C-alpha cells in the first residue's frame, strides 16, 4: 500500500523553503481540498508513473499561494507550482501541533532571492543576500541580509498567522 499515513500523520513537517518530497476521499469540512487538472472521483480509475508527496507548513494567509499561476513570497521564493500542474493540494489548521503548546520552530521561509524559483525547485542556500551595490562576503549588514526568517506562531493570532500543514500530491 502507498505510504500515505507517513506523510499526513507525520509527527513534524519541514519548512516551506526546505520542503520534503516522498517519492511514492471523504475528508471533512475543515480540510482545504483543491484539485487542478484532474477530478478527485476519477483518481481510483487512473494509473500514474510517479506520485510525489510534498509536505511543508506555512501560515494561513499563504495557503492561497500554493496554486498554479500565483505570486507572492511563498510561491516565488519557496515553493512554486507549474502553470500546467496536475494534482491536488491539501491543507489543514495545525495550531494544536505547531504552536505554543508544542513550540515547534521547524517552519522557516525565504525572504530574499535574486530571481524567482522555477516550478518544483528547492533552494536551501543560506548565503547572505546582496540587496545593494557592495559585496556581502558572508557579512550580515546594510543591504546584506540573511535570506531566511522565522515564523512566530502564537496562540492569540487569528488563523491568518496560525500554522497550516500543506500536502501537495503531484500525479506524473
Amino acid at each position, epitope marked *: 500500500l502507498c505510504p500515505f499515513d507517513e506523510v499526513f500523520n507525520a*509527527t*513534524r513537517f*519541514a*519548512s516551506v523553503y*526546505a520542503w520534503n518530497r516522498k517519492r511514492i476521499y471523504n475528508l471533512a469540512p475543515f480540510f482545504t481540498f483543491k484539485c487542478y487538472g484532474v477530478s478527485p472521483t476519477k483518481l481510483n480509475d487512473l494509473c500514474f508513473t510517479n506520485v510525489y508527496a510534498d509536505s511543508f507548513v506555512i501560515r494561513g494567509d499563504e495557503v492561497r499561494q500554493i496554486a498554479p499561476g500565483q505570486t507572492g513570497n511563498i510561491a516565488d521564493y519557496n515553493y512554486k507550482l507549474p502553470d500546467d500542474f496536475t494534482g491536488c493540494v491539501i491543507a489543514w489548521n495545525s495550531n494544536k501541533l505547531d504552536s*505554543k503548546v508544542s*513550540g*515547534n*520552530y*521547524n517552519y*522557516l521561509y525565504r525572504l530574499f532571492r535574486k530571481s524567482n524559483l522555477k516550478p518544483f525547485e528547492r533552494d*536551501i542556500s*543560506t548565503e547572505i543576500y546582496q540587496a545593494g551595490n557592495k559585496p556581502c562576503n558572508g557579512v*550580515a*549588514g546594510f543591504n546584506c541580509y*540573511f535570506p*531566511l*526568517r*522565522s515564523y*512566530s506562531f*502564537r*496562540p*492569540t493570532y487569528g488563523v491568518g498567522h496560525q500554522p497550516y500543514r500543506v500536502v501537495v500530491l503531484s500525479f506524473e
Partner: antibody, heavy 116, light 110 residues
Framework: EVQLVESGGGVVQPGRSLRLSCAAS????????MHWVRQAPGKGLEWVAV????????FYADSVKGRFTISRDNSKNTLYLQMNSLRVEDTAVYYC?????????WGQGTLVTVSS | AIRMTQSPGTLSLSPGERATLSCRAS???????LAWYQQKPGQAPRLLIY???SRATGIPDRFSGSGSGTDFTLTISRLEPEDFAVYYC??????????FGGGTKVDIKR
C-alpha cells in the same frame, strides 16, 4: 516536563581539546534544533553555534569559527560540542538550549575553565 | 550588526513596586522577534517573554511586554521577592545568530 543536562566541562590548558555533551529527554529530540550559548563569569550571554534540524546547516559565531565543531547523535538524544585550540577567552558557562525561537527550556550549564 | 542596549544598568526598587525595563535597538525591528529572560545567580536563563508580548508557559501574569520598531519594554506590575534578578532582552528570530542585551539588574532598595 522536558529537561536537559550537560557535562564534559572542566579545566583545560590553552591549545588542548575538550568535548561537551548535552543529554535531552521528554521530547522528540530529532525534531528540534539545538544551540550552544556561553556566558563568561560576570559578563553577558554570547551565542556560540547552532545545529539546525531542517537541512543540517551548522553556523558558528565568528569568535569560534574553525576551532569549535557542533554535532549530534539523534539516536542517543545527545548534543556535542568539540572545542579545539581552546583559548583563555573561551572560559565561560556553556548553556545547551533549544533553537525553538527564542529558547523554551535550557540546560544545566557546565563550566569550562581554560587556564595555564 | 544589531546591538541591543538595556537601560538602566541598575534598577533599585522595593518589593511591591512597579518595574519598567527598557530595551533599545540600533535598527527598526519586527515585534515578532523580541524576547525577554530572567536569570538568577547560578541558574540558566529562564524564558519570560517571546514575540514582544507573549508569556511563556508558567510565567506569572505580572510580567508584560510591549513595544514595536526600536523601543521595547518589560513591565512587572508588582515586584515580589522572587522577581529580583537579572533580565536580558534578545533579538532572536531573524538570523541564526542570537544577539543578547547587556543586562539590567533589579536589586533591593534601602
Amino acid at each position: 516536563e522536558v529537561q536537559l543536562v550537560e557535562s564534559g566541562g572542566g579545566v583545560v590548558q590553552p591549545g588542548r581539546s575538550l568535548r561537551l555533551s548535552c543529554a535531552a529527554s521528554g521530547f522528540t529530540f530529532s525534531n528540534y534544533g539545538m544551540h550552544w550559548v556561553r556566558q563568561a563569569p560576570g559578563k553577558g550571554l554570547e551565542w556560540v553555534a547552532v545545529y539546525w534540524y531542517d537541512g543540517g546547516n551548522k553556523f558558528y559565531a565568528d569568535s569560534v569559527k574553525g576551532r569549535f565543531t557542533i554535532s549530534r547523535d539523534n539516536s542517543k538524544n545527545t548534543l556535542y560540542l568539540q572545542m579545539n585550540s581552546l583559548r583563555v577567552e573561551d572560559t565561560a558557562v556553556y548553556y545547551c538550549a533549544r533553537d525553538t525561537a527564542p529558547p523554551d527550556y535550557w540546560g544545566q550549564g557546565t563550566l569550562v575553565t581554560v587556564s595555564s | 550588526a544589531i546591538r541591543m542596549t538595556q537601560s538602566p544598568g541598575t534598577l533599585s526598587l522595593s518589593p511591591g513596586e512597579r518595574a519598567t525595563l527598557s530595551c533599545r535597538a540600533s535598527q527598526s525591528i519586527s515585534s515578532s522577534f523580541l524576547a525577554w529572560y530572567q536569570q538568577k545567580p547560578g541558574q540558566a536563563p529562564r524564558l519570560l517573554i517571546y514575540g514582544a508580548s507573549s508569556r511563556a508557559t508558567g510565567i506569572p501574569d505580572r510580567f508584560s511586554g510591549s513595544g514595536s520598531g526600536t523601543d521595547f519594554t518589560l513591565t512587572i506590575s508588582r515586584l515580589e521577592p522572587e522577581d529580583f534578578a537579572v533580565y536580558y532582552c534578545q533579538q532572536y528570530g531573524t538570523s541564526p545568530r542570537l544577539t543578547f542585551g547587556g543586562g539590567t539588574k533589579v536589586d533591593i532598595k534601602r
